[PDB]
Ligand binder design. Structure first.
Ligand SMILES: CSc1[nH]nc(-c2ccc(Cl)cc2)c1C#N
Ligand SMILES: [Cl-]
Ligand SMILES: [Cl-]
Lengths: 138, 140
């Protein structure tokens, strides 16, 4: 049954391979490892989650955050672009992409990211953070 | 699909990481993909754009070509998802937002579509695209 999803490209979530409440528990445990600084374990758990459902925006954001913490900034930025697309109107991944671009020495790209947050987002606290980066970029 | 390939690659080096296909060859394959597309050979064009997006997913031109094919095929959610990737990457115009609005209308999500068309009117400098977006808004 699982092999069928491997051959059809479907997710494990599409075939309800693990119950909903158990997946919730695994996501909460992943976030616990993350908040405790247990980065290697959080990375295993967020990779597990993204294998289970690679369209879940919160699962992708968790793995992207791990990569950003590990200073794998391009790999983080790649996942953030997917996370943005799947959620359509949440500019948090665009904000974090701006941070990654600064670390990649691409300040004009970073400015474009933070400006996009300011222009489109309805999240006032997020826009405040984005503006503080814009104020600092030369 | 293209998005699942991108995520699996990120979970797990890639072909692009080793410069396995040079720029000029990718340019040629892109032009061949549109040759198929322009002749109505949509299935072959889809294979070629999928090939391009496996090699270099984070490329606005490849993403936009594949999104157009899904919209024509009435695979509206897949099209909307790819248009949003194109916009996030830096696509310097609001055309992917406009087309996402069209897709959301077909998905019976008129409130999502309204948000898309309103973004076009507020932020695009393409006066013709703005008129088109307003005509959809007038109908919602
Ligand atoms: C869920 S309401 C909504 N707000 N913004 C969008 C949006 C933004 C950029 C792009 Cl490229 C496509 C769509 C959207 C949708 N769908
Ligand atoms: Cl959507
Ligand atoms: Cl730059």
């Amino acid at each position: 049954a699982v092999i069928d999803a491997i051959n059809s490209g479907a997710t494990l979530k599409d075939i309800n391979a693990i119950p909903d409440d158990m997946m919730d528990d695994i996501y909460s445990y992943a976030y616990d490892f993350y908040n405790k600084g247990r980065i290697e374990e959080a990375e295993v758990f967020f990779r597990f989650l993204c294998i289970y459902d690679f369209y879940n925006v919160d699962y992708i954001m968790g793995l992207a955050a791990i990569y950003q913490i590990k200073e794998q900034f391009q790999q983080a930025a790649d996942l953030y672009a997917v996370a943005f697309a799947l959620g359509k109107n949440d500019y948090t991944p665009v904000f974090h992409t701006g941070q990654c671009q600064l670390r990649l020495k691409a300040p004009l790209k970073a400015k474009e990211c933070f400006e996009l947050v300011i222009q489109h987002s309805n999240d006032e606290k997020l826009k405040i953070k984005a503006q503080s980066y814009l104020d600092a970029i030369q």
